[PDB]
Amino acid sequence: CQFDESTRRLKC
Amino acid sequence: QVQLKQSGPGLVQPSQSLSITCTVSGFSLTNYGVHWVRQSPGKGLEWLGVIWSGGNTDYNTPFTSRLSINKDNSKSQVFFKMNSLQSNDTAIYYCARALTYYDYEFAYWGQGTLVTVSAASTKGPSVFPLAPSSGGTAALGCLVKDYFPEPVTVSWNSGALTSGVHTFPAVLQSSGLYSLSSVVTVPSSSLGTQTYICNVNHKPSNTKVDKRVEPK
Amino acid sequence: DILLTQSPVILSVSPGERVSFSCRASQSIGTNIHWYQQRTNGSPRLLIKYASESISGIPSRFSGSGSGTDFTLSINSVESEDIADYYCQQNNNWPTTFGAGTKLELKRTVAAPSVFIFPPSDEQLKSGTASVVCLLNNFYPREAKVQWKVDNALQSGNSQESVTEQDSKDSTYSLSSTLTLSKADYEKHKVYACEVTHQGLSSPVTKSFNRGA
């Protein structure tokens, strides 16, 4: 999983 | 109430410096230290440093050389500055305060400052209507096209409309510019009575647009 | 630096069920561990401090335990508002470090999307670019197919998709598919169709318009 700055959520 | 409010998001060129201001209220910088934390795609959450009540500073080891924290007790401002940024220094940067003056359990956070490291230039977006035209429920929205960098804020009717709002994550186009849509579902019988405005603000470019969305 | 390993990376549970998060440390850190919640476009919210102590204003379904190297955050009856990522933080050794986080997803009943299609606005056509938007609204689960067709010609490579995170109230997703043409191409064609395939529909649903009318 990587953190996503747009949503501030982890995208797996 | 206790709050921390940081300065706006924006673009910093490669090898250039980053500067964020953390303004606090509900407590005094002479009684609590202020910490700085970032959150990046590559390294996740990452403690950067702290300035204590007495003005002393600690910096996480890989940042000792390019980090400097200062403050102004009278004006309740903490100043964050980091030197020579690279691409992997793009992250959400936060200021935060702990529960007790000496500790590290972060009960209060700033709203965050998304920082983009790019030699590209800022560009405001164009705002286009997604005009309505099943079962008495009408869908409408706004197209926020061709801006850089992230982020952009969208609301509806100056904040008074939130139920049924979906604002989609931005997507990076082949041009290198971002794009998103923001939609809302409303009763179709209310399209004759109500006005529907999407409030778009792209702070990196000082672009602020209210777009009225009507049936064609 | 202490390494913090959170397991697993994704948790998928149903409402009212119990759920546990795991945080393991590369060496003993006593009870010097803190937990955080991060909702969509939020900043971290402090849930538990020192493995097990409660935080003012945090609902009682949150609790934590553990000591040494193995720690557990628990939600004894999960709710839709709990959809978020969860991190752990150690502060027994300098510098304080965070784990990589666990994503919490919620299962719910199958919901079919409501499909809407928007032609491009005359305002956008004045810049020589056309955006056709197809909206799939409030559906579960996340997997769905959007197939674009212009004058019965299949479109490939000229559309982009964006999906919301899970809604905190009804646990649904919404999707936008945007088909992007030049203005010249858009004016040369007539029938613009968006076909949607989803588990909640017994047939593909097609929303279309004729340029003009």
Residue numbers in the entry:
A (entry chain E): 1 to 12
B (entry chain B): 1 to 133, 138 to 220
C (entry chain A): 1 to 213
Direct quotes from the study:
Multiple strategies have been developed to modify monoclonal antibodies, including chemical conjugation and protein engineering. Owing to the location of the binding site within the Fab, we have termed the peptide a meditope (medi-, middle, + -tope, place). Based on our observations, the peptide–Fab interaction does not affect antigen binding. Herein, multiple crystal structures of meditope peptide derivatives incorporating natural and unnatural amino acids bound to the cetuximab Fab domain are presented.
In a second effort to create favorable hydrogen-bonding interactions, Leu5 was substituted with glutamine and, separately, glutamate. Based on the few available cetuximab structures at the time, we anticipated that the hydroxyl of Thr90 could be oriented to favor interactions with the carbonyl O atom of a glutamine or glutamic acid. We also noticed an extended water network in an apo structure solved in-house; upon binding of the L5E/Q meditope, the waters could facilitate interactions between the meditope and Tyr182. Unfavorable repulsive electrostatic forces between glutamate in position 5 and Glu154 HC are likely to be responsible for the low affinity and the fast off-rate, which is ∼30 times that of the original meditope.
